[PDB]
Design a protein around this nucleic acid. Structure first.
Lengths: 106, 43, 119, 89, 121
RNA sequence: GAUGUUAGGAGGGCAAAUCCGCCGAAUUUAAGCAUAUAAUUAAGCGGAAGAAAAGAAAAUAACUAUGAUUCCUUUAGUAACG
RNA sequence: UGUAGGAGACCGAUAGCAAACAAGUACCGUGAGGGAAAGAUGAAAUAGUACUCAGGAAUGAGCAAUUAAAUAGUACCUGAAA
RNA sequence: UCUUAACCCACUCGUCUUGAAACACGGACCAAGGAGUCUAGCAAAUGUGCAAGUGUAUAUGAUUCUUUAAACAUUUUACGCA
RNA sequence: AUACUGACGUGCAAAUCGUUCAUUUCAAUCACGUUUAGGGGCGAAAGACUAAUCGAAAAGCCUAUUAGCUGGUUAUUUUCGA
RNA sequence: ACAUCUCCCUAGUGCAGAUCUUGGUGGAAGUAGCAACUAUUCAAAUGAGAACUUUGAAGACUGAAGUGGAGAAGGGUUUCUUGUCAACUGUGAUUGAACAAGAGUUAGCCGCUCCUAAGGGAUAGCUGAAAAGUGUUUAAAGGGGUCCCCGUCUCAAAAGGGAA
RNA sequence: AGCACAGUCUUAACGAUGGAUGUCUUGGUUCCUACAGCGAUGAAGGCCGCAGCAAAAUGCGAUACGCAAUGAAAAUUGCAGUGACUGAAUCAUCAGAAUGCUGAAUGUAAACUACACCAAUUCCCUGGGAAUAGUGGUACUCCUACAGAAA
């Protein structure tokens, strides 16, 4: 180190040269993903392949205002709907078994 | 040496057969050779 | 010279007699070639191919007869059985893979997935 | 001593203690200890060390014309049933 | 152009040009047909055969008509009766002509040729 | 538990780029060197596959909570360790 | 890695894979191993040096001779410097 | 222009070293090849676009499909940094 | 293999050759086969020997190890210049 | 097959030198040198051509611890006949252990092959992650017998043993 | 038909020498896309063969630079030789047939073409006749079944 230069924070002391990867497949990978889902939807008669999530709260002090897609409706919400677990699997709604359905408002 | 082994004798006879020069007709449609004194079979 | 279908016409005694005849002729050509004579040398290739045709036809007929002999009854001899990859041979059957417990059978039959629309 | 360390030593050289090796074909069978240096012949294991790339590559599948594997190629692509043929005229 | 199945490289096309199977050799031994014949057969160009009658349109030998002697598939050269040349020792052989340089007058008819003409028309 | 050229079957070995296990260093860095560093890297011995392993809560949170696995963007060169 | 495609603001025969090639070869090492040098006549040789003379022969020369071209003749493109 | 002449002047180049014409070191000769680069992160500089915002991340989308491996788009409290 | 510190010393030879000299019935010499392997062996001890290799063999790799030290470090003009 | 100075991007981008790398080449130089091992001569033949090929005559030498016979290792068609001379045969060369075309090694009895040894590799076990380290040592195991009595195996000598 | 000085150095011209330069390029190079295991039913590796004239990498395996079959399909050719006017000559495809000795390599062996043991074996013909010393099987571990022994 010399002059006004800040202390470095690089970790290239270990043999990184065989532990490094450069992405040149990105846009074609994106095309392949698009092609795969498009092919799948079309094969299913063009019927939706999309999954309908519950709305759930984002956690702690920072994100408590915000709400996002959750894992699955679970029994109390399904019972309130009048829908079976078997029906929930049969249809596009998202499925779970251990997400508690919490407060009344949610 | 003077007495011999059937496998060795056969391979040596092969090497001798391979050694002999190319057909001249082939050039009308020779990269490798051995000489016994200066090149041994290395066996 | 000789052509496969003509050989396939022949009975096994007749085909073998032709095979033996060709060997004797082939030997005569070979002896002639070994001698200082150059009269018939090129014909030896043709005869060797003719012998090859005889043997292929006889062997195909014999193989078919063996297959006819071991028609069904579950087991052909080892190397008359299916030669396929060792892995493919080892592999679990799709039929067995498909099969499932009674509770699984109930689950499948009762609850398959269905296709849908919206307004 | 006329067998001295240097030229004199080489005159007493006779009696090769390495031979060809049937499972090798590259001269490497130590006769005295009955062992191939290159391919490990008395052992079932083939002695295929990974510390030399040159040694690793200079014997490999596709050296020896591949008498069944070469034949196997294309069959995978084709996917005919075994025992099947083209149809007659 | 549009297909991405086949290379647009110089390199692959050349290798294919040199390593040709026989049907490919036959394709690149085709010659253009005579004008009324093109109308007759509905066909621009035809693979050369033994007893064909060609006219030369290029080289020092241009404007000569004649029957095809022998076809050399390997050097891609046809030989025609009146394009003789004497060699260094005065032996007479026929000049080999690449099939690009000849236009076909009377094609030889045969069963295989009939099938080709039936396929084309 | 033995014994069987009894009848039917299976394993062995090879190939290895990626994968999974074990077993497992040092040159090197600190301008010396011992802890630390190279690095749970290389070599060694094993096992697999067209991907493998992982995976359906003895989990994270302290919210208005989330809710199998994998991957990316990130947190983050940060809490922390020295 | 094996096989198959498609590529290039890549190299252009001392470069690029060790290998544009009969090279993982020759060759060297007791062996483990180590490991090369090595492409191009012309449009066409189904144009590859006919013929004559002098030569023991090699060769040489030619009034002779292919080619558009032979100080283009297969150790054949161009043919720098020393 | 080349060429010698002649008058006057004219010590082996590179090199490390305060100091080489040196009894300091390297250089028989000629040809080709032959040595401050690339990545990461940071800084100042200067350009450029925007400004209390900025970048559009992973990714989605399209009447985008030789060149397209880019280009184009993103149905109001994501994240980095400020 | 003692001496001639002989010849030889770009050899006949990376230890030869000549003459001299020691040994010659035993702790003898020779062959072949065999054993003991690398911080290991083996040593009538000289750190001797272990394939023209030894106060730690050969092969390959970590490795392009590291080097405050040696050497080299490539067209032109102009400006400021230790 | 070649340019762009019109503009601008990009780079394995500029050599005299590194005891540079690689390749070629000089002066040194027709020089150093071709000195172990007592010696050749004459005539003839062959051939283009003969000091050193062949034949003969002489002269000589090796001097049974032989430049003589045989065999082992090791080499491997080098052998032999028939050709032969681009390069090689450190001189010459018609010669040749070089090159070209062929030919040729014959076993009941000679060897190997067989037997065991010094040795080596395993089974049985047992350890060790395995790799390996060991080897009758906590075994239900090859032979002889009218169901009985015996028993670790295996390779290892081209000079030991070993029919002819 | 004469006349030159020599040697050394320099210059120009013209050649030898040498293989640079330039031009190529059925090769390399990196990336992206795509599929992706072989083996006791004997792989990979290694030998030994096999071409009319044939040494070699290539190719093939005792039917051996291909056999059969399919789709193309008239030539082949250094010489000899082999066909056509479409199962022939040529290719490509390649599913059928064939695939020496080995090699995990597995009857005991191994610087060996050495050596055991049990089955003698094959073909042809329509329930029989001929050939041939030839061909297989017999490793180690595991498993299921059976057996006769041992609680």
């Amino acid at each position: 180190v010399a002059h006004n230069n800040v202390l470095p924070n690089v970790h290239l002391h270990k043999w990184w040269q065989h532990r490094v990867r450069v992405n040149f497949s990105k846009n074609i990978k994106k095309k392949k993903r698009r092609l795969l889902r498009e092919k799948r939807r079309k094969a299913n008669g063009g019927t939706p392949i999309e999954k309908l999530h519950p709305i759930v709260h984002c956690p702690t002090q920072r994100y408590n205002f915000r709400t996002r897609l959750g894992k699955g409706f679970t029994f109390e919400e399904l019972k309130g709907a009048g829908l079976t677990p078997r029906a929930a699997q049969t249809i596009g709604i998202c499925y779970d078994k251990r997400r508690k359905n919490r407060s009344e408002e949610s | 040496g003077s007495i011999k082994r059937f496998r060795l004798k056969q391979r040596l006879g092969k090497c001798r057969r391979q050694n002999r020069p190319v057909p001249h007709w082939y050039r009308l449609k020779n990269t490798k050779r051995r000489h016994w004194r200066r090149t041994k079979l290395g066996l | 010279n000789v052509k496969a279908y003509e050989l396939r016409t022949l009975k096994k005694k007749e085909l073998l007699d032709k095979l033996d005849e060709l060997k004797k002729e082939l030997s005569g050509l070979r002896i002639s070639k070994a001698l200082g004579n150059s009269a018939k040398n090129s014909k030896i290739h043709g005869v060797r191919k003719n012998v090859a045709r005889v043997l292929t036809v006889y062997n195909q007929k014999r193989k078919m007869e063996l297959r006819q002999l071991y028609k069904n009854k579950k087991f052909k001899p080892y190397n008359l059985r299916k030669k396929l990859t060792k892995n493919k041979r080892l592999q679990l059957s799709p039929k067995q893979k498909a099969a499932m417990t009674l509770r699984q059978k109930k689950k499948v039959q009762n609850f398959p997935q269905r296709k849908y629309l919206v307004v | 001593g006329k067998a001295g360390k240097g030229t004199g030593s080489f005159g007493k050289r006779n009696g090769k203690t390495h031979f060809l090796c049937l499972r090798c074909g590259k001269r490497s069978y130590h006769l005295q200890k009955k062992k191939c240096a290159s391919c490990g012949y008395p052992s079932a294991k083939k002695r295929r060390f990974n510390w030399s790339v040159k040694a690793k590559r200079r014997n490999t599948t596709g050296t020896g014309r591949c008498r069944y594997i070469k034949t196997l190629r294309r069959k995978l692509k084709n996917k005919f049933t075994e025992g099947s043929t083209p149809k007659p005229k | 152009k549009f297909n991405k199945q086949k290379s647009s490289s110089r390199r692959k096309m050349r290798k294919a040009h040199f390593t040709a199977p026989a049907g490919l050799r036959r394709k690149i031994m085709s010659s253009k047909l005579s004008k009324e014949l093109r109308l007759k057969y509905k066909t621009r160009s035809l693979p050369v055969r033994k007893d064909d009658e060609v006219l030369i349109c290029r080289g020092h030998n241009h404007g000569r008509e004649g029957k095809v002697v022998k076809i050399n598939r390997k050097r891609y050269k046809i030989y025609v009766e009146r394009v003789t040349r004497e060699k260094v020792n005065g032996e007479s052989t026929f000049i080999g002509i690449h099939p690009s340089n000849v236009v076909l007058t009377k094609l030889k008819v045969d069963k295989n040729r009939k099938k080709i003409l039936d396929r084309k028309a």
